[PDB]
Each structure stands twice: as structure tokens, then as C-alpha cells.
Write a protein that binds this ligand. Structure first.
Ligand SMILES: *[C@@H]1O[C@H](CO)[C@@H](O)[C@H](O)[C@H]1NC(C)=O
Ligand SMILES: *[C@@H]1O[C@H](CO)[C@@H](O)[C@H](O)[C@H]1NC(C)=O
Ligand SMILES: *[C@@H]1O[C@H](CO)[C@@H](O)[C@H](O)[C@H]1NC(C)=O
Ligand SMILES: *[C@@H]1O[C@H](CO)[C@@H](O)[C@H](O)[C@H]1NC(C)=O
Ligand SMILES: *[C@@H]1O[C@H](CO)[C@@H](O)[C@H](O)[C@H]1NC(C)=O
Ligand SMILES: *[C@@H]1O[C@H](CO)[C@@H](O)[C@H](O)[C@H]1NC(C)=O
Lengths: 37, 463, 475
């Protein structure tokens, strides 16, 4: 019974990490374009 | 705590201005023009009876055929903004020492290109300007930094005409009275075009270097520039965006100078205060070298060279690329600064502190990782240096090792080049950099996360 | 005190590293790669003839070899009895030589059942089953056996087997017209029967501009099951030294390196006799022994390679013979391998001195207190790895070309982890037990077995961190 509980309580932290990676990925994408390409 | 919302709204205004200002620098015809010029040349084959193009040059006669047929075909259809120029750099006979044993068979030697060994001597049928060494300053050139070596600005040059009647004649004369002898080491072709209806003119520089061991190596540089074709459609809007960007930068700099001067005696005791000053100085430099670039381009709106002089536009391309790079860095840092406005969340404030409490340990791990990475790179360079074409230079060994990590190994020629010590490099690299050294990163992160969360829990839940 | 000793051990190591890096930079340039690249593309990419499209890399039969020998080979070899410059710069030293190895008829035993069906058999290549009798129009050296000792040869270790240095050879000429006639005469009186098992072609070039020889060898192997397997080797040798001040600088650096190695040997002898059988447990004193041994081996190889240059001297008074430069090319490769490994170990030895501040000794301690567990688990991991590799070798060993040999199986299984598979040939090679292998391997390796190294290291790091923090704080 612990797998569902640990996948449900640890959802906000994973979502926050995903948000941070989305921001850090769009910044890197904007640097990648315009630099040489 | 109301200034936080003021900073948030100011930063959002700045970000919306900057996003538009950088979307205005992603025109469709700045990249497609280069892609269509790099295919109009470099891909069309020689006149006939051959399939090799410039990208696959193989000999000297191939270069002569390309110069006669394909170059004089793509330049003239059936503007040039001045006239094309062709240049040669060569070395001196007897510039190296032939061993006494190998004599009576090898008379002359031509050393690899170097400034100390380059010759300054007249040619044979020496009536033109392409048979006398002119100094570096007299050619208005600086350097190229090619593949094999770096080439000076001097050499033997010949300005071409403006049509198929007074151009092919001198090229044929150069081929008849032999110009590219065994001593040649580099050949340059320089010209601008301005064949685009939109201003958007591009300069092109083609290099063909002859190594000291036979063969040819080609290289190319295509570089488009900018002009001010101001229209009421979208250009006044971008001018307003640029001037309001300058106003925003002025506001930011006066703000930061106010706080640094009037209180706290030192502004550089955090991370967000050592970042916005960097952004401000980069923006000031970008504005300066943008105004200067526009002023430089303004005067040269001539198109009346009348095939008398050769335009020299490399000085403008240098500033163009510098401005592009500095703007790319500025936009990236502006986007990074966004974290300050979302770090004070209920669940985002346990990962930021985790990643800031272990920065010293992460740097300490990165140094250890890079030492071993570079040791492996040097070993691969020494072992597979002359065969694999992936490990041909150190800068390519590093970039290949960074691609084995991303699951892009070839391994077809690594094992072919060396049956023993070829697999030993690969398997040990994988073992000691995927099982042992990429598990030392998450270990530090996990320990820091656990201790930070425990401290926060015993702090909040207790009080 | 102790700082003086650390500085004494650090300055000498820095000087050693500087000397080693100077030598390594001097023994590797960028004009050496393009030399080999051009010489390779000249012979290995040009089609055998103006009409065909097969090159040396894709020979498929014994007639393609004769097309290549009277074709691309000569065109790329002679380039217009004056001397022949390959790219107008590469002088062709001496004359090329073509050699052959063959096994004798009746070297195996046909089963009695169909002995009236098949007449002759020729075994796979082996020294015990090699032909020695003359054959054909036994005029000269192309039809008469010549032993290894009388031919100045050595083994090769090709792809299928390890060939000796003997056989039936022939030295070609300096001009194209005579070489074409010689090869045509060899082709008329059939020189390549069913008994041939290998064929070698060797030559050399100089390129006096940058003083650097280049030795070229081409091998064609005819397996007992019919077919052709080609192989090549271009080696940029360097024999004539001391013509530039840079060469003298390198000689001085080599002497200094010898001095450093002698000093390190003396220091090792001084320290071993103190801690008898106790000296050999630090991983920093079990590593210096490796460096010393490798450096001594490299010094011996370099001396033995630069001292025996008799072949060059013998060739210098006779520029109309075959220059035998294969031994020098072999020892150059061996020296490069040894030097590369030695430099790698010397670079790794920086952790002796760099691990003297906090947050640098925590990582070293974490590595030191979990090495035993890592070795213990690597034993199990590699047992399972070898079991899977042997299963794949038994099931896919004759069809997939990635599991053709045991080593190929191991390397393919290492590449599967990175995410580099085909799986289009694995499935069609065996519809059952092919997918089972792949699925179970992926599950037991990515899910369960690679998640244990991380657990071990993560546990040990936290244990060490807590231990050090408790020791320091509670003092
Ligand atoms: C280069 O100089 C040497 C020096 O004597 C001379 O022998 C040789 O002929 C010269 N090269 C040519 C092409 O004349
Ligand atoms: C001399 O000048 C003419 C053009 O006036 C040129 O064609 C020729 O190549 C030059 N050199 C000679 C005649 O040796
Ligand atoms: C270099 O530029 C100057 C500009 O004043 C010009 O006078 C000179 O002729 C140029 N050099 C050439 C075209 O070789
Ligand atoms: C090979 O030897 C067998 C006898 O062992 C003989 O019958 C056969 O003719 C031989 N083949 C050739 C090609 O000489
Ligand atoms: C064998 O005899 C001589 C050399 O001994 C040679 O000229 C002749 O062509 C050879 N006979 C052949 C190949 O039939
Ligand atoms: C083998 O080497 C010796 C030198 O000791 C030489 O005289 C002989 O001709 C060589 N054998 C050949 C080239 O077949």
C-alpha cells in the first residue's frame, strides 16, 4: 500500500523540478539559436 | 513585502520587451539566404565530365577547373558589389634541410607554411601585379586562422574584372603561365554579392590550402550583414522596442548604482546582485557596438564601386558576430534571472536551498571528473590519433568523448584501428564514467536534500 | 617539517609532468594525420577500373584482386627509369614486393563415403600444413619456397589466422611498363590456385618536405570456405632524426626523462627496504611501481628500436631493392602504446597531491571506503554479464555479425547499455529466444543491476560525511 502513497505525496516536488527544467531548457534553446544558427 | 510585486511586474515588462526584440532578430531570409548561397556554390559540379564539386576537391587541376567553369558560372547568370579578388600564399625553395643520405634524388624541399619561411621574391612572366610580393598592410588584411595553420594577410593577389570577357582571359593566362606551382600553400577567393532584393548582403571567403604532403583542403565562410530598411509596417515598432529597452537598462543601472552607493557598503554579497550588474554591462556594450555598427554600415551604402576598387567588409563582419554573441549571452542571462521570482514557493524552496548548499561539493566533484575526462581524451588522442578521423585533434577527442556519453559511439573503426587497447579504452571508459563517476553526483545531491529537509522539518514543525 | 616534504615531493612531480608533456606534444603533430589520410584514400577508394565501382575495401573474388593489381594499384603507385613521386612529393623507395602463402593438396582427410566424389582438399592455414614444393613453371623466386629466415620476415596476425613470414615472393620493377608485364606473366601462368591462403603487398614512401617515412602494407586473405577478406596498414614512420634544433631539444628532454626515471628507481629502492611487504598497500605506492616498470620498458624499447636501423643503412647504398621496414613499423606502434599508457597513469597520479583540502578528501575517502564493496559487486555483475554473453554467442553466433566472436558479444552488450542496438537482425535471427534475451537482459540490467552501484556509493558518501562532521564538531 506504500507505492501509491509515495507516488502521490511526491508529485508536487517532481512537478516543481519539471517546471525548473522547462525554464532552464527554454533558456538554453534560446541561446542555441541565434548563436551560430 | 510589496516591493516584490513591483520587481516582478518590472521584470515581466522587461522580459516581454526583450522577447519581442529577440524575435525581431530571427528573420527568415537571413538563414535561407546563406543556405541558398552555400548551395549555389560548393555544390554545383565542375563544367562537365566531372561530378566533384568544391566540397570534394581532390587535386590542383580540379581547383583550376572549378575556378574556370563553376566559379565563373555561379557569379554571372545567363550584382557583385565591387569586384572579386584572388590571392596566393607560397613558401620558399630550399627552406628546409634535406638529409645528406637522401641526396642526388631529392633536389628541393618545401617546408610547411610559416611566416619565417614564406618567400618574398618575384615570379617569371612578371608584368602583372600577381607576381610581386606585397606586404601585409598594403593588402588591408589581418589573418584567417585556417585549418592546418594560420595565414598572413600578404601574398600575391590579382583583382578580377566584371564579366566573362575580361575575367576568364586573365584566369586562362594564369593557368597557361603556371601560377600554382609546387610552392603554393594557400589560395583565397574573396567577394561580396548583394543579390538579394531585401538589403541583406553577404560576404564570402573561400580558402583552398595545399598541405605539404599533397592534396587539397577546402574551407568556406559565408557571412550576411544588416541594413536599415525602415518601414511603418514592423520597423518603427522594433525601433520603439529598442529605445524602450535602452530606457529600461538606464533605469536598471541608475537603480543599482543608487543601492550600491547609498547603503550596505557592498552590493556584491549574493548571487542576484552579481548577475544583474553583469547583464547591465553586457547590455551597455551591446548598445554601443550596435550604434557603432549601424554608423559604420550607413556610410558604405554605396553600390557605386564601378569595378575599380575591391570592398573590404571583414571589419564589419567582425563586429556583427561580436554583437550577435553578446546579445545571445545577454538574453540567456535575462532568462536565467527568472528563478529569483519563483524560488519563494512552498515546494520550490527545498530544491533551491539543496542546490545552493552543495555547490562547493559539486565544484569539487566536477574538477575530479574533468581531470579523468581529459586524461582519457589525451590517451585516445595518442592511440587513435592518425587513423580514426574522430580522434584527429584534441578538440575533437573531447567532443567525441562527450558523444560516447550520449549513446553515440561508432566503435566500428575504434576496434579496427587497434584490436587490443581499442576495446580496453572503450569498456574501461564506460565502466569508470557511467557506473562510478555519474553516481557520485546524485549521491551528493541526495545527502544534501536529506539533511536540508530534516533541518527544515525539525525547524518548522517544532516552532 | 611536513610542508617541506610535501613541496619536495610536489616540485619534482611537476617537473616530471612538464618533461613528459613536452615529449608527448613533440611526438604527435597534425601534418601526420593528413599524410596517412591522403595515402589511404589514394589506394582504398579509387575504383579498380574506369568501368567498375569496386575498390580494395570491397573485393569479393579472386578475379577482383587481379583487376586491382593491374589497375588502381599501379595508377596510384607509379604516377608517371626516373624516380616516381606519388603526389609529386612522395618518393617511392625501391621496388614493391608481392608475396604469397599456400597450403598443400591433401592436407586434410576426406571421409571414406564420398572419397570417389571429391578429389582434393586444402585445409585452413597452419604452419604444419603449408606447401613447400615448387609449382608451375618453376623459373625463379615466384615459384620456389623461401623460408622465413632467408626472407627476413616475421608473423602478422591477420583476421582469420597468424601468417608466417615465408612464402613465394617477387620483387617488382621501378617503372610501370615492366611491372605491368610482370603481373601479366603471373596472371597467365596461374599463380593464385585454390591452395592460396594469403597475399601481401608492401612498399614505402619518403616525402622529404616533412622528414617522415610511410610504410604501406596490404593483405588479402582467402578463407577455406571461399571468398576474400582485405586489410590495410599505413604507418607514418620516422627514422632520420637530428636535422633540426627541435630534434636536439627532444633528445635533451629524453635524457632528462631518463634521469628522472633513474632517480625514481633509486627512491623506490630506498623506500621498499624499510617497509618490507608493508610498502605494497597504498594504491599510491602500488601505482608508482607501475609507472616505473612501464617507463623502463619504454626506454628499453626505444633503445632497441633506434639502435637497430641496419636496414636503412643497407638500403641507402642500393636504391634498387626492397626496403624491409616492417620491424621498425611494429616497434613504433608498440612504443606509442606504451607511452600513451604511461602518460595516462602519470596524469592520474595528480590525486596524490590535489587531495589535501576539505571537500577534496571527502570524495577520496568515499572512493576509498567503498572500493571493497564495488569490487565485490562487480564480481557478480560480471558473472551475469559473461553468462548472457555466452548465451548470445551460442544463439546468434553465426548470423548477426555482432555476436560473431566472444569479444564481439561482450562489446555489443556494453553498447546495448548505451542504447545502440539494431534488434532488426536479432529478432529475425531467432524469433523465439531472441526477444527473450533482449527483454530479460534490459530488465535485469537497467532496472536492478545498475541501480546497485548508485546505492553503494550514495550510502558510503553519506556515512563518510556524517562521520567526519561528527568527528570535527565533537572535538
Ligand atoms: C631549389 O634550390 C636548390 C638549391 O640548389 C636547387 O638545386 C633546385 O634546383 C631549386 N629548385 C628548382 C625547382 O629549381
Ligand atoms: C608581359 O605582359 C603581358 C601583358 O602586357 C602579359 O600577357 C605577359 O604574360 C607578360 N609577361 C611576359 C610577356 O613574359
Ligand atoms: C587599402 O585601403 C586603402 C584605403 O584608404 C586604399 O587606399 C588601398 O588602396 C587599399 N589597398 C589595396 C586596395 O590593395
Ligand atoms: C591432390 O592429391 C590427390 C591425392 O591425394 C590427387 O588425387 C589429386 O589429383 C591432387 N590434386 C591436384 C590438383 O594435384
Ligand atoms: C621461364 O623461363 C624464362 C626464365 O627462366 C622466362 O623468360 C620464360 O618466359 C618462362 N617461361 C614461361 C613463363 O612459360
Ligand atoms: C635479408 O637480409 C640480408 C641482410 O643480412 C640481405 O643480404 C638479404 O638480401 C635479405 N633477403 C632478401 C632481401 O630476400
Amino acid at each position: 500500500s506504500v507505492f501509491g502513497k509515495t507516488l502521490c505525496r511526491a508529485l508536487p516536488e517532481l512537478l516543481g523540478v519539471t517546471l525548473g527544467l522547462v525554464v532552464l531548457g527554454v533558456a538554453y534553446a534560446q541561446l542555441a539559436i541565434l548563436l551560430v544558427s | 513585502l510589496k516591493s516584490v510585486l513591483r520587481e516582478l511586474v518590472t521584470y515581466l515588462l522587461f522580459l516581454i520587451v526583450l522577447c519581442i526584440l529577440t524575435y525581431g532578430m530571427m528573420s527568415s531570409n537571413v538563414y535561407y539566404y546563406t543556405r541558398m548561397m552555400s548551395q549555389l556554390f560548393l555544390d554545383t559540379p565542375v563544367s562537365k565530365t566531372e561530378k566533384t564539386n568544391f566540397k570534394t576537391l581532390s587535386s590542383m587541376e580540379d581547383f583550376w577547373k572549378f575556378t574556370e567553369g563553376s566559379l565563373l558560372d555561379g557569379l554571372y547568370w545567363k550584382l557583385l558589389l565591387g569586384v572579386p579578388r584572388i590571392r596566393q600564399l607560397r613558401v620558399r625553395n630550399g627552406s628546409c634541410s634535406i638529409p645528406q643520405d637522401l641526396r642526388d634524388e631529392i633536389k628541393e624541399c618545401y617546408d610547411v607554411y610559416s611566416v619565417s619561411s614564406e618567400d618574398r621574391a618575384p615570379f617569371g612572366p612578371r608584368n602583372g601585379t600577381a607576381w610581386i610580393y606585397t606586404s601585409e598592410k598594403d593588402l588591408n588584411g589581418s589573418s584567417h586562422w585556417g585549418i592546418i595553420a594560420t595565414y598572413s594577410g600578404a601574398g600575391y593577389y590579382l583583382d578580377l574584372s566584371r564579366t566573362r570577357e575580361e575575367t576568364a582571359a586573365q584566369v586562362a593566362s594564369l593557368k597557361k603561365n603556371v601560377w600554382l606551382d609546387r610552392g603554393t600553400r594557400a589560395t583565397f577567393i574573396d567577394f561580396s554579392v548583394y543579390n538579394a532584393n531585401i538589403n541583406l548582403f553577404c560576404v564570402v571567403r573561400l580558402l583552398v590550402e595545399f598541405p605539404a604532403t599533397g592534396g587539397v583542403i577546402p574551407s568556406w565562410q559565408f557571412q550576411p550583414l544588416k541594413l536599415i530598411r525602415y518601414v511603418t509596417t514592423f520597423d518603427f515598432f522594433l525601433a520603439a522596442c529598442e529605445i524602450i529597452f535602452c530606457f529600461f537598462i538606464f533605469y536598471y543601472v541608475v537603480e543599482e548604482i543608487l543601492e550600491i552607493r547609498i547603503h550596505k557598503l557592498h552590493y556584491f554579497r549574493s548571487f542576484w546582485n552579481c548577475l544583474d550588474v553583469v547583464i547591465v554591462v553586457l547590455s551597455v556594450v551591446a548598445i554601443g557596438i550596435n550604434i557603432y555598427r549601424t554608423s559604420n554600415v550607413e556610410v558604405l551604402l554605396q553600390f557605386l564601386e564601378d569595378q575599380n576598387t575591391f570592398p573590404n567588409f571583414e571589419h564589419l563582419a567582425y563586429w556583427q558576430i561580436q554583437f550577435n554573441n553578446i546579445a545571445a549571452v545577454t538574453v540567456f542571462f535575462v532568462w536565467i534571472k527568472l528563478f529569483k521570482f519563483i524560488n519563494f514557493n512552498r515546494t520550490m524552496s527545498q530544491l533551491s536551498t539543496t542546490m545552493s548548499r552543495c555547490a562547493k561539493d559539486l565544484f569539487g566533484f566536477a574538477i575530479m571528473f574533468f581531470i579523468i575526462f581529459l586524461a582519457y581524451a589525451q590517451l585516445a588522442y595518442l592511440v587513435f590519433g592518425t587513423q580514426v578521423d574522430d580522434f584527429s585533434t584534441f578538440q575533437e577527442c573531447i567532443f567525441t568523448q562527450f558523444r560516447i556519453i550520449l549513446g553515440d559511439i561508432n566503435f566500428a573503426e575504434i576496434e579496427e584501428a587497434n584490436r587490443v587497447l581499442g576495446p580496453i579504452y572503450f569498456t574501461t571508459f564506460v565502466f569508470f564514467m557511467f557506473f562510478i563517476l555519474l553516481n557520485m553526483f546524485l549521491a551528493i545531491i541526495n545527502d544534501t536534500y536529506s539533511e536540508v529537509k530534516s533541518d527544515l522539518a525539525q525547524q518548522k514543525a517544532e516552532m
